[PDB]
Structures are given as C-alpha cells and as structure tokens.
Symmetry: D4
Subunit: 207 residues, 8 copies
C-alpha cells in the first residue's frame, strides 16, 4: 500500500534503498513509440515490498541517481518486457542498461504450456497475486498522479524479484540457463534496434 510507496519528482534523492545486487524496474509513458511518447514515470523496487515511483518531467534528460543504478554493472536490472523499458530509458537518458533479466523472455523459455506471458497471468500462476491492469490506459503525463495510478505503477515492480527467483529455478530445472543468459545479453541491442528503426522487424527471420 501507500505506506510502502515513495513518490519522487525527477530522480531518487539517493541510493540508500538500492545498495543491492538486483533492482526491479518499470516505466510509464504516453505510449509505445519512444520518439513520440515521452517517458513519464520510472518505478523501482529493491524486492523488500516497497517501491519508488519517480515522475519524469517533459524535456528531462538526466536523473543521475536512477541512471547510476541503470549503469551499475554489479546490479541486475529486472524488467517484465525489458525490450520496451530499455528503449525508452536509453532514449530518454542516453544510457542503455546492459545487465538485465526479463520475466517475459524467462516465461517464454519456461512456461512452454501456454501462450499467455503477460505479467498479470504470470503473477497469478506463479504467486497467486492479483494484478489489475485498469490504470494502464491513463494519462501518465499528469502533473499529479492519482492514488490508483501510483499503486498500479508500484505493483508492476513489487513482484519481479520473486518471479525472477522462480524462473531461475525453472531455467535450471529445464537446463536452459545459458539460453536465457544469451537472450538477456542481446536484449539491450534488440532495444537499440527498435530505437534505430527496426522495431517492426525480427532481425533473425528469414523474411
């Protein structure tokens, strides 16, 4: 709840809550096209049940404490569908995180019995946790976010550590750890390809 959500303008005040080896990251934007739709919110969690919700201003190009986390190679950044978050973060702040774990890719490599790899479905199946998608289609650029917006934004990062632990168990069980690591290693370049103009192209397809 709000007792464990901290809301910031522009950047984290410091990294006191992020002296950790992995951080859960998500974004909210005005849409899915980074060259048109600005970054509006960045959400973080340490995995301790709290979240930081950082409002990004129009035209903002810097956030040194957040960007230090994104650049710190000793901290794994956990995303759900990091392909998008990596693109908007690199586009906005000029830094592409390069140590990452993605729960969507992990799901596609382990939940081979379904085609539903969205966060809501994964949190339901793996954690019995209910995620509401209601605030996803809202004005994330508003000067003041609603309480429902803040709690929705925070819920997208509160569970990614636990999902990562379970997916790592499954990847070990099915002997796919090196496959997953190679996908994660390429994911920042997949994001770059999107920013450069190949967002509709599977670069590995025959045609």
């Amino acid at each position: 709840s709000m007792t464990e959500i901290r809301v910031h303008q522009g950047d984290l005040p410091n990294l006191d809550n992020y002296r950790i080896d992995a951080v859960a990251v998500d974004t909210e934007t005005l849409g899915l096209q980074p060259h048109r739709d600005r970054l509006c919110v960045v959400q973080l969690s340490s995995g301790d049940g709290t979240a930081d919700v950082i409002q990004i201003a129009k035209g903002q190009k810097s956030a040194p404490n957040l960007v230090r986390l994104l650049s710190d190679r000793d901290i794994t950044k956990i995303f759900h569908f990091g392909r998008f978050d990596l693109a908007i973060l690199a586009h906005t702040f000029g830094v592409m995180p390069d140590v990452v774990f993605c729960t969507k890719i992990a799901s596609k490599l382990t939940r081979t019995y379904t085609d539903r790899h969205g966060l809501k479905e994964i949190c339901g199946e793996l954690l019995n946790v209910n995620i509401s998608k209601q605030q996803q289609s809202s004005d994330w650029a508003a000067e003041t976010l609603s309480r429902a917006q803040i709690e929705y934004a925070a819920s997208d990062v509160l569970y990614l550590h636990r999902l990562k632990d379970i997916f790592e168990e499954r990847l070990k069980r099915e002997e796919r750890e090196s496959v997953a690591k190679a996908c994660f290693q390429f994911l920042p370049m997949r994001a770059n390809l999107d920013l450069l103009g190949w967002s509709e192209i599977d670069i590995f397809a025959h045609s």
Copy 2:
C-alpha cells in the same frame, strides 16, 4: 571456377589456411530433427568451391569440423541461422565466430524487403544465381552437375558480399549492431533446435 566434390570430409585443410570461410548446407528439408544434412559447401573466396557429400547417419567430419570450431576463422553464411542449426545438430559443434549476409543485408539494404541471396548477388555483384536445383534430392548418392554447380554458387560469392556489407555497416555506423546480432546467432540457432523455431523470443506476443 573449380568445384571439388568430396565424400564425407575434406581430404585436408590445404586450401583453408585462411581467416574467413564461406559455408552453406543442403539437406532433405528445413526440419533438422527429420531432414538430414546432405551436403556442406565451402569456399576460401578464391573462386573455387568444395562440395562435401555427407552420408546418412554421419556425425563426424574432422577436417570440416576443425574449421567450424576454429575461433580464428570467421564462418560466412547466408542465413546462418539455419546452417548453424543443422551443423550443430549433425556434428555436435556450434560455430561461434560468424558473419551472416542476410542479417547484414537487413541492416544495410534498408530500401528493400528482398534479402535473398539471388537478389543480393544480382544487385551488389551483377551475378545471376539460379534457384532451380534448390528443390532437388540432395540425398542422392550421386549429385547432378546442376546440383553441384548450384551448391557451389551458394558459397562462391559470400566473401565479396561480406566485404561490401562491411563497408556499408561502417558507412552507416552499424558495426556494433551487426556484431551483436552475429554473436547471438548461434543461440538463435540453438533455440530453433530446442523447439522455439517458430517463436520470435523477443516479441511481446
């Protein structure tokens, strides 16, 4: 042009003391778990090619495999995603120093959606590739002259294409992008073998 046809393996590596080798395969089809490797083609880029027939059930070819495993030799493919899969499935070795002219074309020939080898050879080299023998019995005990010449044609021009694509990648400042794609390409081939050949592992849905 000279085309040397071999059974099982190269006799030696005397023509392949080189830094990059052009490689293609022919099979009974596109499903490596069903369709066996039938031919491996090589060229040093000198205008000659080696066409190696692979027997049913064959799982070794020491001279060929030495080249495929040699980290100091770049293996040049057109659509290496497939060739890497069938080579690793057959011989147990996954090359990890590669250049793929299809990926290179997709990163440089941004004005077209035609990234096949025939189209690329015609545009960049004014070389005409015939596709007629693509649909043939590559498992035949004796290949026809047309099969042999088609198989050789798939590797005779890859060095020249690689040089041009490298120029374009530099010109448009996409060298690090291409290198990352080539670095992931063996794992993309691995994903295909393990059961994800119909899945873009990076797509949202």
Copy 3:
C-alpha cells in the same frame, strides 16, 4: 433536461455561444441510402436539443444558421460522418469544427480505443450506454431511451474539448489538430463523392 423538436429548433435563443456540440442519428452509415433522422445539439450547459428530421426534409433554417455561422465552432465526435450527412441533407457544409475523435487520436497515444464511450469513461468518469445505437431512429415517436441516448452524445462534448485542448497544448500539437479540423469538411465531401473507402493520402 432534453428538448425534443419536430423539424428544426424553434429559435436560436439557447445558442448565442462560441461553440455548439452536434451529433446526428440516421438509418445507417450510407448517406445516399440512409436518411438523416435526428440532429442533436447542446450549448454545454448540461441540456440538449433533440430535433427529429422528417423523411424528405430539405431545410432546417435555424439549425443551418448555426452550422453556417463561422463564429461558432461545431464540436463533433467523429464529425467526418456527421458533416457528410448534414451537408448531404441540408446542402451546407460546416467549416469551423472540432472533432473529439481526431483530438483523441492526437493525444490519447496510449490506447487504440477512441470511441466516445471510452473517452467519456476515462476523461469524465461518465458512463455512456450504447444500447439504443441500434434502434429505429426513423420512428415517428422516439422512445425515452432513444432520446436519452441521442442527448448523451452531445451533453459532454464541450467538457471533452476543453480537456483535449489542454492536452493538445501540453504536447504542442495545436497546429496539427487545427489543420486536421480544417481538412475534415473536405474529407466528408470526399466520402459523399465516392471515396468513403479510400484513404486519399495512402500510397496504395
């Protein structure tokens, strides 16, 4: 409060305003086959006028006066259709318009749902019921549910336009929007002339 009229507004006493919300109801989406049945208006004050248009009716002077008045912005949701049927029926094409569908497509970039019900729910927390959309709009006597539906289509457009204007300004798209609104009458004319299925600007 909904005021129901036969044929035309009795007068323009309620419409000495800078902008008027407009919608239509018809027998379907093909102006050459499907007649104009209803024109709805609102001044923005939470009341509406619902004008039943008779089969074969060729004029409505008070309504056409508003539609032709260049000092009054006509607000539509998907004006592309309303402009076509109004011009086809009464012979006058409005040329000072604001369309909340176009404005939504220029500002609600986070969704592909640009219908009026979705927009009212999101921006106003107003629930639009679509149940009476598929009904006999040519009926001699409209049902209360029809009348309330038709009015609901115009009662909120002023409030939507104010919000969309703020977003257009925030994202610096005011002049893009203005140009789209400027072309919308000719887009409607293109539909009437036989290009309704053609994006005239597409390559193919």
Copy 4:
C-alpha cells in the same frame, strides 16, 4: 537526355525561373529518422533534369531550399507525402505550394487501383519507366549511369502529367477537392514525421 549532376546543391537558379518545378528524392529507405536523404531530383519540364547528391550529415542546400520555399512556384511531386517529409526533416523547410500526381491519379483515374508513376506514365504518355534501379545504393559516392537515368526519369514527366490531370480534374469538377488535398499534404507529411505515419488520422478506427 541531358542530366546535370551536382554535389550538394544547384550551382544557381538559372534553369528554375519558372512557375512550377518537378521534384523527387532518393533515400536509403522509407524511414526518414533512419534513412538519410541521398539525392534530390529537379526538372523544369524542358526535357532535362538536375540530379543533386546530398552528403551524409548535410544540413543545408540554399538554392534548392529557395525553390522549396518560393510560394510562387508549385512543387510537383509523385507521392509528395514522402518527399515533403524527408525534405522538411533534412533541411527544415516544408513546401506549402504543391501538386501531387498520385493524389491527382486517385481523384481522376477512378477505373483502376494502379496509381504508381510507371503505370501513370505508360497510360497517359506512352512512356516506359524502368524500376530496376529503385532498389540500389542511393548513398553511393558515385551514382551509376543507370541510377542517374532512373532518378531523372522520376521528374522528366511530372509537368506533362500535371497538365493532363488538371484537365481531368476540371472535366470531372474535382479541382477544389484536389486543392484541399494538396493543401493538407504538408501536414500529412508532418504527421508522419511526428509519429503517425501508420495512422489514417481521419479513420473511425
């Protein structure tokens, strides 16, 4: 066929003291944010053409931009939606006096869905445009003769096409419709550059 080839810009406007100029562009692809402007072609309609090679990183072209900004000169394009976008993106100036033969074709050649320049030139003028060089490296330091002839053919006939389409627009009483379309075209190109290139802004859904 006299084709004058320039680096960067026209040397002067001596050939373009005219009321309408035919304009085309060649690029590395259809995405202006990725694919740079490589060539601008111009014709006064006298049977000659100017082919201007645009350098990578080139930000200005004062003589060409003078024509593009001159409100007394109609810029004639075939599918100006694209040309307007890449020119405005590259040099910062959006022409606002335009005629587009693709829009004119769609408003007059109502008996067909084939509105490409090759089709239009064949039907209206019995002139055969070859499309072979369309897929080529338009960023090459030296364009080939075939490339230069292709680039010129894109502009050599637009004046003649414009005259015929104007007659058909008059005959079918669609002049004001065409004029409104041409007037919105720069904003349609702007919409593309801003991120709506895949969206018919006027569609219901």
Copy 5:
C-alpha cells in the same frame, strides 16, 4: 405457460392452420442437408401457440405439413428461410414458393446494424429474449427435453409479429418490390445450395 403441441411425424390435421400465413422453422443434426437429417419442423399460426413435429430418420412424407408448405394461398414465414427451404425440399421433395424471410427483411430495413440474427431482432423489435442455449443439442433424440421444445417453439412464436413490423418498414422505405423479388428468388437460392452451390454467391463477379 406457452402451449406447445408435440407431434410424431406429421400434424394430425390442419385445424389450427386455416390461416393466410404460417411461421416455419426446422431443427436438424447440422447444416449440411445431404449428411444431416431433418429432425424437427416447428409451426405457429401466430396465436401464441406452436406445433413441434418430430421427423423420424428416413421419413420421406408428412402429408399435412407438406400441404401447408405447398398451399400457394398460405405465406410461409421463416427466419433465414434459405436453409429451411433447402432441408424441407430435400426431405419431402416439395419446395415452398410463397415465402417471407425475416432475415432478408431485416437486411433490407435494419440498415443501421450488421446483427440480423433472430435473437437480436426479437430483442430490438419486440423486447423478447430468445435463449440460444439449446441450438447446439441432439435434435435427433427420441424424446426432446422441455428446454429443446421451448427453444424450438420460440423460433416460430414471434415471426408473424416480426413480419408485420418489417412490412411497415419496407413500405416506409419504399422497398416492398425489392423484398418481394428477393423472396421470389429465395427457393431457387435454396435449390442452388442443394445442387452444389451452397458456398457460392451466384451473383458475384468473383
């Protein structure tokens, strides 16, 4: 509380059908007349009652029903008569030729929608709810359930009232002669289906 008379094979007589128009529907084992037999024929005079006639496997005759179907003084009202006409003609060898179809009528009058199903039409025109739950059931069963019997009856209980409304709309929009021509071709459209053209719009360019 709807009175539904269930019969084996045929109506016992035509006492309830000395009328100018009869509502007709069928139930079958599926939509392919050469494979899927006619199982049920439903009739209503429009008086709020219905007759539900179970057709046996291999049954080729039902003289009282077939008299109604052949009587040119009686308009047969269907919803999507294209199918019912086909299965009735295939089974009994008689093609009704005086018909009214509420689906065609809807397509010519409810121009503001693409939803021309009976359930949607009954809801809009009459504020009557049709349940579709029993549509996919074993219509060949020796004993139909009450749910099946009520479903079969609901298909015919409202066609007279629908026809009256559609006739008013056809007159208002001046489409009576258009509809009449469509109804007159409908038996031949059904015949075309039986002959092998069921997947072909015979009037299409391609």
Copy 6:
C-alpha cells in the same frame, strides 16, 4: 478487318437490330455508378460487327438504344450484366428485364474452374484471344483511340456464340430453370446495388 461503327449519343436507327437477341456491354469511368458516368455503350447483332456508342457527360436519354433495352421480345446478352444493368438503369432510367448473362451461365456450367472472366471463357470456348490492355483507359475521352474502340467491340462480338454454347450446356446438365431464375432476379440484384447493397450478398446468413 472487323466492322465497328462508332456513334455519338445514340444509334442512328435500329436497322441492324431487328433481331431477337442483342449483345450489350458498357464502359464507364469506374465501378461506382453514382460517381463514375456511363461513357460507352457497345452493341452487336452477332454478325461479326459492332456498334460503339459514346455517351456524353450528363446524357440521360438515347431513344434508339433505350427502345432495344426496353423491348421485351429482344434478349439482352451481357457478360456480368449485374454491372451493366445498374449503370444503364441509373443513366437512362430503364431497367432491361429480358437478359442472359454469360458470367452467371459460366458459373452454372463451367463447374471445373473458378476463372469466369470473359477472356478466359472466350479462349476456352471459342479459341478467341481477348486483350485486356485497354480496360484501364480514359473511357470519357472525347475521341476514343482505335485500340479502345477495338477493345470495346471485342466485349460484344462473341456473346451470341457464347450464349449458344452455354445454352447447350445448361440443357445438357439440366439447369435451364436455375439459369432462368438467376437471370430473372438479375435486374433486382442490379437495383439492390444502386440502392446501396452493392457490397452485400442479400442471401447470405451473415
């Protein structure tokens, strides 16, 4: 070597058309009758000659042509008459109602193919090559080119011969009454197109 008489406005008289069936085709500015005007009407008596009639912008009458179109003792033969009937009725205010359509006949007889265009039918049944190059041309041109005129004539030169062969096949496969009912509805199918149903198969379930 083929006699093609070109007229402006109308036939000068009916001297060449004291016959029991006439082949008819149209050319227009496109497939939308409300936007795309009738530009040409072509006729042939079946004697290897053709009349090509240019129709002016806004022209609404053509008394000799319309006498033929209205004459119930003269069958009008079309290929895809569905369209020709629509534009002719739209322009001249008369709907021909004694018609034969070689496209419908082909669909009812050439059951082994889905290629029912005039070029394919002429090649298969007559070994006659029809060129389509001039189909996409400006049929409103004040002066038609020789190639346009020959194309327009070729659309009507062979319809009698096609009709005779299709009538043999309809007889052989016993589909004459089916074809006749299709031809009888075709004017109303054209009317439906003009009234706003040109994209709707009025007989489809959905």
Copy 7:
C-alpha cells in the same frame, strides 16, 4: 470429493484395471514432445475414481502402465488421443493400437457444432462442468496441488460415459465403421507427428 490415488512413477499394480477399457490422459510441459516432457499420466477404470501418476524427468519405463497400453484386449479411451499417443510412445517406446477417441467421435456425431473440446462435450452430454484453470500450470512440479490433481483426474473420470453415448450415436447414424477406421489410423497419425509432420494434414491436396 472424488477418490484420487496419486502415484510416483507407475501404478503399484493392475488390480483396479482388470477391465475391457481404460480411460487415459497425460499432462506435459507443453505440446512439443521433443522438448516438453511427460509429467503425469491419468487413468480411470470408469468407477468414478482415478489414478494420477507423476512421471519423473528422464523416466523411461513404467511397467504396469505400459502393460495396459500394450494390452490388445483393453481399449484405451482418450480425448484427443492423437497427442496422448505421441507423448506416450515417445516417452515409453510403446504405441497403443486399440483406442477410442472422444474428439474424433464428437466430430463424427456432433455435426451441429464446431466445439469439440472436452469441457463442451462434458457439459452437453453429461451436464458435467470441467474447469480448465489448472491446464496452464507447472505439471512438472515435484508436488502437484490439489487443484492440479482434481483437474488431471477430471480428464479421465468421464470418458467411459462419453464413449457409451458416442457409440450410441455412431450406431444411430451408421458411422461405426468410419469411426473404427479413424481409430485404427490414429496411432500412425501420432507417429507422423513424432516424425515431423505434426503441422501437415497428410491427406490434403495442398
């Protein structure tokens, strides 16, 4: 609460399976047998109880289970046996060849619908509600949840009753020999899938 016996590796014995027909289903990590391992085999004698057998990663034999699968005197009942047969033969090396499939049976008899899933069939023929919630779950888990165990049992608890009804319908519609032939080919259809034709209808023209 249903009696469900949960086993590790194999049935302890065949004492509950001295019967003429056994209901069989499987659970796996997915639909690709060369990637997705067999995790569970479920059995029912038809007495309202089930056996749920957890199959370990890398397990290559299950002697009692395979005895049933290879017993030509015991009909193996599946719903969509095409998949179960493939994963069973791939895992244990034995292809059952005396089978009945309720999915094929449904396609041959429930001709009035295109919904041939187990849930829809159980709802219609038995008024039994199958929940599909646990279908997407980690079937490889060391400890299956009670929800998983009940779901896995529900897939075999009703197949005897369905088979009885479908045999009645196949007889009513005179399709017993067609159905038998389909069941006899089903093992080879599963083999074709394992060999690389899982996406190919081997009998299609193209």
Copy 8:
C-alpha cells in the same frame, strides 16, 4: 504415343494382366454429388494408355470395376483421395489396394511444398506435363486430341514415379508410414462422400 479411346468400358483386360495399374479420372468438377464422372484413364506402365469416356447416367463398367476390385492389383493414383471418391460414388466399388504419388511425395519430397503431378514429373523424370486442358469440357461427346493427350499424360508416368517414391520411402525408412496412409485413403475418400470433405478428421480444431 498410343492412346486407345473407349466408350463406356475397356473391351477386355488383355492389356491389364499386371500387378499394378495407373488410374486417373476426369469430371465436370470437384463435387462428386454434382459433377459426374466423365473419363477414366488407365495405363499398364508400358508407355500407352486407355481413355474411357463414361456416359451421363452410366452406372456400370464391368472390366474397369474388375480391375478396381482386384486385390492382386495395386491401383496407382496421383491424389487418389479424389479419384477413389468419384469412382466409388459412380460404380459402387471402393478400391482398397492403392498407392498415391501425392501422399508419397509429401512423405519424401520434404524439401518443397510443391506436390502437384506436373512438378513431380518435371523433377523426378524431366517430363513436362501441360495443364492447359485441365479446364475443359470433359463431358464433351468427342474429346479433342489435346484433351485425350492430357488425360493420357496423367497415367503414363505413375508407375515410374511409384518406383522412385518406393526407393525414397525405403531410403528414409518410411514404408510402414506410407502403407498406413494408403490403407486409410479409401476411408478418407468415404469421409469426403459422407460430408466431411472440408474437415481434417484428425485435427484438434
């Protein structure tokens, strides 16, 4: 090329004292309940063929039906699924000893999706089949020479194709698979006649 044309039936079985017979049909179309059987073609594989015109309403063809019922004679088809249906529909006898070159192609030519008789004849035999007469009036009282040659060409090569496919089925160890497909083929044809022609009975959905 000797083609013997008969009315109704073979005059005798003198040319068919053989272990395998090549069979094809021609019809008025693909719907056996509407489109009658018009022609039945036979070849012993000796490079000659018999073309049997079947009359409208003909219910009997005793010599042909003797061959179709003879369990000592394999009936070779290309796409026997259809021919089996129209033959059983017309004469009441379903052959149950069959070989189908289309099924055999799908089981062996795994490198292509082109399994038509023309493609197969060109690849395996270098024989060119013309499809021109396929769309013709097969019900004509007098077939043209081109029709008769087309119908003969459909059976003249099936023995030679069967031999090659039998070699490939052996090579790839798929003989039992093919045999089971051929043994279900009559029931697949029966399924089509009973009303399942648009349904893959084995599909999940």
